[PDB]
Design a protein around this ligand. Structure first.
Ligand SMILES: *[C@@H]1O[C@H](CO)[C@@H](O[C@@H]2O[C@H](CO)[C@@H](O[C@@H]3O[C@H](CO)[C@@H](O)[C@H](O[C@H]4O[C@H](CO)[C@@H](O)[C@H](O)[C@@H]4O)[C@@H]3O)[C@H](O)[C@H]2NC(C)=O)[C@H](O)[C@H]1NC(C)=O
Ligand SMILES: *[C@@H]1O[C@H](CO)[C@@H](O[C@@H]2O[C@H](CO)[C@@H](O[C@@H]3O[C@H](CO)[C@@H](O)[C@H](O)[C@@H]3O)[C@H](O)[C@H]2NC(C)=O)[C@H](O)[C@H]1NC(C)=O
Ligand SMILES: *[C@@H]1O[C@H](CO)[C@@H](O[C@@H]2O[C@H](CO)[C@@H](O)[C@H](O)[C@H]2NC(C)=O)[C@H](O)[C@H]1NC(C)=O
Ligand SMILES: *[C@@H]1O[C@H](CO)[C@@H](O[C@@H]2O[C@H](CO)[C@@H](O)[C@H](O)[C@H]2NC(C)=O)[C@H](O)[C@H]1NC(C)=O
Ligand SMILES: *[C@@H]1O[C@H](CO)[C@@H](O[C@@H]2O[C@H](CO)[C@@H](O)[C@H](O)[C@H]2NC(C)=O)[C@H](O)[C@H]1NC(C)=O
Ligand SMILES: *[C@@H]1O[C@H](CO)[C@@H](O[C@@H]2O[C@H](CO)[C@@H](O)[C@H](O)[C@H]2NC(C)=O)[C@H](O)[C@H]1NC(C)=O
Ligand SMILES: *[C@@H]1O[C@H](CO)[C@@H](O[C@@H]2O[C@H](CO)[C@@H](O)[C@H](O)[C@H]2NC(C)=O)[C@H](O)[C@H]1NC(C)=O
Ligand SMILES: *[C@@H]1O[C@H](CO)[C@@H](O[C@@H]2O[C@H](CO)[C@@H](O)[C@H](O)[C@H]2NC(C)=O)[C@H](O)[C@H]1NC(C)=O
Ligand SMILES: *[C@@H]1O[C@H](CO)[C@@H](O[C@@H]2O[C@H](CO)[C@@H](O)[C@H](O)[C@H]2NC(C)=O)[C@H](O)[C@H]1NC(C)=O
Ligand SMILES: *[C@@H]1O[C@H](CO)[C@@H](O[C@@H]2O[C@H](CO)[C@@H](O)[C@H](O)[C@H]2NC(C)=O)[C@H](O)[C@H]1NC(C)=O
Ligand SMILES: *[C@@H]1O[C@H](CO)[C@@H](O[C@@H]2O[C@H](CO)[C@@H](O)[C@H](O)[C@H]2NC(C)=O)[C@H](O)[C@H]1NC(C)=O
Ligand SMILES: *[C@@H]1O[C@H](CO)[C@@H](O[C@@H]2O[C@H](CO)[C@@H](O)[C@H](O)[C@H]2NC(C)=O)[C@H](O)[C@H]1NC(C)=O
Ligand SMILES: *[C@@H]1O[C@H](CO)[C@@H](O[C@@H]2O[C@H](CO)[C@@H](O)[C@H](O)[C@H]2NC(C)=O)[C@H](O)[C@H]1NC(C)=O
Ligand SMILES: *[C@@H]1O[C@H](CO)[C@@H](O)[C@H](O)[C@H]1NC(C)=O
Ligand SMILES: *[C@@H]1O[C@H](CO)[C@@H](O)[C@H](O)[C@H]1NC(C)=O
Ligand SMILES: *[C@@H]1O[C@H](CO)[C@@H](O)[C@H](O)[C@H]1NC(C)=O
Ligand SMILES: *[C@@H]1O[C@H](CO)[C@@H](O)[C@H](O)[C@H]1NC(C)=O
Ligand SMILES: *[C@@H]1O[C@H](CO)[C@@H](O)[C@H](O)[C@H]1NC(C)=O
Ligand SMILES: *[C@@H]1O[C@H](CO)[C@@H](O)[C@H](O)[C@H]1NC(C)=O
Lengths: 147, 449, 40
């Protein structure tokens, strides 16, 4: 079931992982409400300057929405999994990062309070993702070619 | 347990953010409609279908006293007026000497003055005598007798174009992609702390920009009871926002009839002035009903006493000084600028136990300076015919005196001049959030070498 | 008494507030920024 944009914000990590295509298409293709910026046929002079001063403020939010989108899509290409909305990266979950056990996480926690606990360690979890992919692409695949 | 990171994109989580929103006004054909300063070249036609996706289990913290939507609405309003008035004609020739006189022959309490001055014809070497009918607030004395306008020292009085129209039209504030707006639906929300019922909205409801003081016209109502709302209630310098659950109607008029002259200035640029009183001289006034006003104060007193004490005496006084913008009630209706005397509404005591309307006398001036910028002033061209207005009063802006004595008698006065109380009383239930799609979580997946 | 002057002391008309009345004003211009037409 699709509840609309952000509808699974209060559900569990287990029950909100059904709805990942909603916050992806409304992260870019909610811009269909902004393509009206090709306005109606304007009249003569007298506020020809007001037409372009407010034209940039409409276009900074168009360009800024695009070039914050690509750098988070490219980062999945560094880790080895581009395109896929679910990928698996083969990096061992160090037990100093977090806690309990696998099963009280997906059943009675939400993603918001989960993001709080693991935000403190996110720059070191992103550190091992670009290292277990580089070891595979330049070492393993060119060795399994010739051998 | 030996687990492996998996990576999820599209996960519904948020961080708080600050950004600039979309004007997003409503729109029609408007094929003959005059360019309107509030929208036109700023807005885009509105999504006709907002979807209010109700969230489950979410409890978010809002704060209306540190919001940025109020702080950028006050900046856009100055920038919407300052960009429309670039092409408009300056009234630099009218800083001359005026041979004026009274209009009536028997003074009872006069209002208008009848003047005379020179003005260029088509060919700009010939001068002719022209007259007009200026109000006495907009004319000061130099030294039969000789008068001049109120601001020939410092200001360039820019005549507002006649093809313009200033009027409340509902603006919908929208967020661009990657951003979202959250609306509270709790009916006891005093303005801070957790809101246990949150729903994401694409675009807010249409607020009607009306610039008034001491009273909030055409606002949004409450839900069950009267909602009293302030920041640090024991602090004197903080205003007290009041919001009604039922509207209190008002009826306003200018009962004298007027026409327009067409005194030209230059090639293609004319000037409008008051010409004749076709009828009889009458004071502009406004009516508030009395039995509805005395019951609407029966609720504001009732829930003031939960903040101060049951056995206290609550009194209303009227004012203590200032300019016309903060001692009186300002409008913008029908194209003119009314400043009504409200010392008849805010006058009663409360002691903890049909058709007669209250009349309010009202002044008119046509050289206004809004936001008091140095050396700038506007001018409203006269409207042909009598003016009629009907409005609701939904809310007040009181303030508390509070010196250090021991008495049990509080006194509350209406308050005026800061426009951020008009906007903060409407966008209180909102907050903008950011959407962060990437996330990490442990599982048993293993890339498969 | 001239030793080698630099400044010059001038006089001209200027509009008051009301732009039909003219008054005498002065200033002190350098001699490089003033040229001669034809007291004087
Ligand atoms: C609070 O809200 C109320 C409710 O909307 C609002 O009252 C509205 O005031 C406007 C003022 O512009 C009214 O619009 C006028 O209505 C009269 C009715 O006969 C028309 O004649 C007018 O048409 C003229 O409009 C221009 C004026 O010069 C001209 O260019 C044009 O050619 C016409 O001559 C105009 O439509 C509106 O009708 C009322 N609304 C209702 C329901 O009566 C009030 O103004 C708000 N309060 C404040 C302080 O703004
Ligand atoms: C608007 O509503 C909010 C919440 O409904 C009010 O906040 C509440 O403020 C009181 C102030 O006394 C807080 O009580 C105090 O709590 C602290 C511990 O936090 C304690 O040390 C004090 O002895 C006292 O009990 C109360 O906690 C707080 N509510 C919440 C949920 O935290 C706020 O006061 C209201 N505004 C006005 C103007 O009334
Ligand atoms: C709020 O989240 C809970 C998850 O804890 C949703 O599911 C409820 O979970 C409790 C405990 O697991 C059960 O006792 C309830 O029966 C569950 N609800 C239903 C409808 O089965 C809960 O649905 C969410 N809140 C709302 C209003 O939907
Ligand atoms: C035109 O009306 C004004 C407004 O009443 C009259 O103003 C008076 O001006 C004198 C001059 O000092 C004051 O002493 C009075 O107090 C003013 N008010 C009244 C009611 O007299 C003015 O006199 C009128 N014009 C003429 C020519 O009489
Ligand atoms: C304002 O003053 C002007 C003149 O200063 C008045 O216009 C005169 O009205 C009489 C009517 O009895 C005519 O005979 C004159 O020819 C008019 N003079 C000009 C120059 O047109 C005007 O009536 C006065 N307005 C009011 C309201 O008293
Ligand atoms: C322009 O400013 C002057 C200076 O304030 C005004 O003339 C009067 O000047 C004396 C002494 O400087 C003050 O004590 C008076 O209060 C001034 N009168 C007023 C009404 O301010 C002059 O009137 C001003 N002109 C305009 C058109 O405002
Ligand atoms: C205000 O004055 C105007 C005239 O300046 C009045 O308009 C006139 O109304 C009568 C009666 O309908 C017509 O016979 C005239 O042709 C109208 N004159 C013009 C120039 O249109 C208007 O009715 C007055 N308004 C009020 C409320 O009395
Ligand atoms: C404000 O004016 C309106 C008219 O525009 C008044 O409404 C009328 O009130 C009388 C008396 O109750 C009724 O007989 C009429 O039927 C009403 N008009 C309509 C169109 O319904 C209203 O009473 C006035 N308000 C105040 C406070 O004076
Ligand atoms: C309401 O405000 C007015 C002024 O805003 C006050 O009027 C003054 O009243 C005193 C009498 O106590 C007079 O001597 C003053 O001349 C008045 N001021 C003016 C400018 O005329 C009034 O006191 C306030 N309160 C009430 C209950 O009317
Ligand atoms: C606002 O209105 C009140 C009355 O509704 C005005 O108070 C009057 O002030 C004059 C000035 O001396 C007195 O002659 C009256 O007797 C007062 N009326 C009452 C009922 O006391 C008040 O002055 C008005 N505001 C302003 C700024 O003039
Ligand atoms: C001003 O207040 C009146 C009174 O609420 C509004 O008119 C309608 O009044 C009826 C009463 O029979 C209510 O049931 C309606 O909900 C009111 N609104 C509408 C849109 O019909 C009037 O709308 C108010 N003015 C504004 C601008 O909202
Ligand atoms: C003001 O100073 C100038 C600069 O010295 C004097 O200019 C002289 O102008 C005459 C006119 O032809 C020349 O012949 C001289 O060579 C200039 N210089 C000197 C040093 O005399 C001028 O004379 C002075 N003004 C008056 C009124 O004497
Ligand atoms: C420049 O010239 C002006 C006049 O042309 C001088 O101003 C006069 O100074 C005397 C002082 O003795 C006053 O009595 C006069 O009233 C002033 N005149 C005016 C119009 O203000 C000024 O002193 C000269 N400057 C220099 C540096 O010599
Ligand atoms: C786990 O994390 C801690 C601190 O972040 C680090 O010292 C340790 O080497 C990590 N790895 C293990 C225990 O395998
Ligand atoms: C996980 O840990 C909790 C507390 O640390 C414990 O109660 C539970 O038995 C553990 N095992 C599971 C959920 O299989
Ligand atoms: C986050 O990091 C700070 C700085 O080391 C630390 O004090 C805090 O306890 C950490 N919080 C969590 C939940 O790990
Ligand atoms: C309003 O009604 C109350 C209660 O009936 C009464 O005490 C009071 O005198 C009335 N008038 C005013 C101006 O408060
Ligand atoms: C004031 O009145 C309210 C009304 O219910 C009551 O709850 C409260 O206890 C009273 N306070 C005092 C101090 O009497
Ligand atoms: C202020 O209140 C007094 C006392 O009720 C009353 O006599 C007076 O008329 C009121 N003032 C106005 C302007 O109505």
């Amino acid at each position: 079931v699709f509840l609309g944009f952000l509808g699974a914000a209060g559900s569990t990590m287990g029950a909100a992982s059904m709805t990942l295509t909603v916050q992806a298409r409304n992260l870019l293709s909610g811009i269909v409400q902004q393509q009206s910026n090709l306005l109606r046929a304007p009249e003569a002079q007298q506020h020809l300057l007001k037409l372009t001063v407010w034209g940039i403020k409409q276009l900074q939010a168009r360009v800024l929405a695009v070039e914050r989108y690509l750098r988070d899509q490219q980062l999945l290409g560094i880790w080895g999994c581009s395109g896929k909305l679910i990928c698996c990266t083969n990096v061992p979950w160090n037990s100093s990062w977090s806690n309990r056990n696998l099963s009280e996480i997906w059943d009675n926690m939400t993603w918001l309070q989960w993001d709080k606990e693991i935000s403190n360690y996110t720059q070191i979890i992103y550190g091992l993702l670009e290292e277990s992919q580089n070891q595979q692409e330049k070492n393993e695949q060119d060795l399994l070619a010739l051998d | 347990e030996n687990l492996w990171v998996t990576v999820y994109y599209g996960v519904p989580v948020w961080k708080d953010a600050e950004t600039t929103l979309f004007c997003a006004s409503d729109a029609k054909a408007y094929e003959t409609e005059k360019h309107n300063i509030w929208a036109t070249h700023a807005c885009v036609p509105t999504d006709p279908n907002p979807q209010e996706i109700h969230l489950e289990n979410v409890t978010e913290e809002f704060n209306m006293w540190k919001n940025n939507m109020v702080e950028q609405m006050h900046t856009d309003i100055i920038s919407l007026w300052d960009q429309s008035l670039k092409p408009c004609v300056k009234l630099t020739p009218l800083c001359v000497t005026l041979q004026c006189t009274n209009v009536t022959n028997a003074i009872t309490d006069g209002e208008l003055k009848n003047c005379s001055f020179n003005m260029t014809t088509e060919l700009r070497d010939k001068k002719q005598k022209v007259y007009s009918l200026f109000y006495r607030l907009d004319v000061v004395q130099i030294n039969n007798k000789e008068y001049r306008l109120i601001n020939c020292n410092t200001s360039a009085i820019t005549m507002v174009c006649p093809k313009l129209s200033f009027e409340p039209i509902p603006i919908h504030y929208c967020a661009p992609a990657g951003f979202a707006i959250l609306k509270c639906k709790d009916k006891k929300f005093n303005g801070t702390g957790p809101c246990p019922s949150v729903s994401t909205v694409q675009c807010t409801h249409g607020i009607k920009p009306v610039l008034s003081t001491q009273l909030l016209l055409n606002g949004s109502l409450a839900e069950e009871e009267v909602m009293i709302r302030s920041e640090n209630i024991t602090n004197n310098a903080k205003n007290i926002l009041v919001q009604f659950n039922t509207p209190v109607q008002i009826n306003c008029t200018r009962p004298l009839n007027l026409t327009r002259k067409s005194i030209r200035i230059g090639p293609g640029q004319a000037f409008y002035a008051m010409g004749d009183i076709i009828g009889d001289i009458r004071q502009a006034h406004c009516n508030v009903s009395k039995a509805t006003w005395n019951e609407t104060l029966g609720k504001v007193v009732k829930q003031l006493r939960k903040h101060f004490g049951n056995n206290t005496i609550i009194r209303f006084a009227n004012s203590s000084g200032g300019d016309l913008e903060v001692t009186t009630h300002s409008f913008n209706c029908g194209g003119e600028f009314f400043y009504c005397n409200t010392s008849g509404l805010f006058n009663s005591t409360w002691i903890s136990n049909s058709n007669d309307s209250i009349t309010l006398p009202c002044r008119i001036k046509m050289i206004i300076n809004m936001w008091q910028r140095i050396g700038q002033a506007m001018y409203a061209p006269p409207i042909q015919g009598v003016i009629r207005c009907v409005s609701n009063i939904t809310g007040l802006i009181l303030t508390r005196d509070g010196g250090s004595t021991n008495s049990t008698t509080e006194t509350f006065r209406p308050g005026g001049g800061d426009m951020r109380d008009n906007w903060r009383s409407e966008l209180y239930k909102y907050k903008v959030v950011k959407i962060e799609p990437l996330g990490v979580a442990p599982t048993r997946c293993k890339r498969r070498v």
